[PDB]
Design an enzyme around this catalytic site. Structure first.
Site, mmCIF file in Angstrom:
data_model
loop_
_atom_site.group_PDB
_atom_site.id
_atom_site.type_symbol
_atom_site.label_atom_id
_atom_site.label_comp_id
_atom_site.label_asym_id
_atom_site.label_seq_id
_atom_site.Cartn_x
_atom_site.Cartn_y
_atom_site.Cartn_z
ATOM 1 N N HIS A 9 0.830 -1.198 0.000
ATOM 2 C CA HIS A 9 0.000 0.000 0.000
ATOM 3 C C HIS A 9 0.871 1.258 0.000
ATOM 4 C CE1 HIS A 9 -0.465 1.294 4.491
ATOM 5 N NE2 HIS A 9 0.703 0.677 4.332
ATOM 6 N N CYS A 63 3.652 5.195 5.597
ATOM 7 C CA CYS A 63 3.767 3.944 6.337
ATOM 8 C C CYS A 63 5.219 3.485 6.292
ATOM 9 C CB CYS A 63 2.885 2.842 5.758
ATOM 10 S SG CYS A 63 3.001 1.247 6.617
ATOM 11 N N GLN A 81 -7.259 -2.863 10.169
ATOM 12 C CA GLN A 81 -8.490 -2.102 10.370
ATOM 13 C C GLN A 81 -9.503 -2.540 9.318
ATOM 14 O OE1 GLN A 81 -8.090 2.372 11.251
ATOM 15 N NE2 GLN A 81 -6.018 1.494 11.442
ATOM 16 N N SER A 104 -5.891 5.493 10.284
ATOM 17 C CA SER A 104 -4.499 5.890 10.075
ATOM 18 C C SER A 104 -4.325 6.973 9.016
ATOM 19 C CB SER A 104 -3.653 4.687 9.632
ATOM 20 O OG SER A 104 -3.515 3.730 10.666
ATOM 21 N N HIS A 107 -5.386 5.450 1.964
ATOM 22 C CA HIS A 107 -4.574 4.461 1.296
ATOM 23 C C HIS A 107 -4.993 4.139 -0.144
ATOM 24 C CE1 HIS A 107 -3.821 2.593 5.513
ATOM 25 N NE2 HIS A 107 -4.934 3.286 5.672
HETATM 26 O O1 LIG Z 1 1.029 0.397 11.398
HETATM 27 C C1 LIG Z 1 1.824 0.281 10.491
HETATM 28 N N1 LIG Z 1 2.291 1.416 9.919
HETATM 29 C C2 LIG Z 1 1.869 2.718 10.469
HETATM 30 C C3 LIG Z 1 0.927 3.314 9.399
HETATM 31 C C4 LIG Z 1 -0.334 2.509 9.276
HETATM 32 C C5 LIG Z 1 -0.464 1.592 8.324
HETATM 33 C C6 LIG Z 1 -1.678 0.779 8.146
HETATM 34 C C7 LIG Z 1 -1.658 -0.382 7.370
HETATM 35 C C8 LIG Z 1 -2.777 -1.167 7.181
HETATM 36 C C9 LIG Z 1 -3.968 -0.790 7.783
HETATM 37 C C10 LIG Z 1 -3.997 0.352 8.550
HETATM 38 C C11 LIG Z 1 -2.877 1.151 8.746
HETATM 39 C C12 LIG Z 1 3.098 3.604 10.466
HETATM 40 O O2 LIG Z 1 4.197 3.109 9.873
HETATM 41 O O3 LIG Z 1 3.055 4.695 10.969
HETATM 42 C C13 LIG Z 1 2.219 -1.006 9.877
HETATM 43 C C14 LIG Z 1 1.337 -2.107 9.974
HETATM 44 C C15 LIG Z 1 1.647 -3.309 9.422
HETATM 45 C C16 LIG Z 1 2.867 -3.474 8.734
HETATM 46 C C17 LIG Z 1 3.205 -4.711 8.154
HETATM 47 C C18 LIG Z 1 4.396 -4.824 7.497
HETATM 48 C C19 LIG Z 1 5.289 -3.754 7.385
HETATM 49 C C20 LIG Z 1 4.984 -2.543 7.940
HETATM 50 C C21 LIG Z 1 3.766 -2.375 8.626
HETATM 51 C C22 LIG Z 1 3.430 -1.139 9.207
#
Ligand SMILES: O=C(N[C@H](C/C=C/c1ccccc1)C(=O)O)c1ccc2ccccc2c1
Length: 113
Positions: A9, A63, A81, A104, A107
């Site tokens: 994403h 992200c 989510q 968050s 996307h």
């Molecule tokens: O929370 C994360 N990023 C947060 C941003 C939110 C990311 C997000 C992703 C899916 C659904 C909702 C939110 C950040 O970096 O600030 C997040 C979640 C899962 C992951 C799995 C693999 C690698 C990196 C990842 C990063």
């Protein structure tokens, strides 16, 4: 529906996001309107072929999966989510979503598996 899908994403956060900071910006200051404008501009360049999704995400996603060119790896239902989950599982592999809204931020999703 498989047990899990694999997606990448591109996340554009905004100042009203759950965690309004990211690896690329100490404080997210853009408005949600501006964020959706960016997302849509990204969608149009990827459809035109002017930009590559994965390259875009590696540079501009808010992200930390940017370092993996957007890849979130595989996940099942009940982990992400719900709005994100629903869009992801509704994609075919190789298909890209439109704007997807979570607490968050906003996307674009690309399903890879
Ligand atoms: O929370 C994360 N990023 C947060 C941003 C939110 C990311 C997000 C992703 C899916 C659904 C909702 C939110 C950040 O970096 O600030 C997040 C979640 C899962 C992951 C799995 C693999 C690698 C990196 C990842 C990063």
């Amino acid at each position: 529906e498989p047990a899990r899908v694999r997606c990448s994403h591109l996340l554009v956060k905004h100042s009203q996001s759950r965690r309004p900071s990211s690896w690329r910006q100490e404080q997210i200051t853009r408005t949600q309107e501006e964020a959706l404008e960016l997302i849509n501009g990204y969608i149009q360049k990827i459809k035109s072929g002017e930009e590559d999704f994965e390259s875009l995400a590696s540079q501009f996603s808010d992200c930390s999966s940017a370092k993996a060119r957007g890849d979130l790896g595989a996940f099942s239902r009940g982990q992400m989510q719900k709005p994100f989950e629903d869009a992801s599982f509704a994609l075919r592999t190789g298909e890209m979503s439109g704007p997807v809204f979570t607490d968050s931020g906003i996307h674009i999703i690309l399903r890879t598996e």
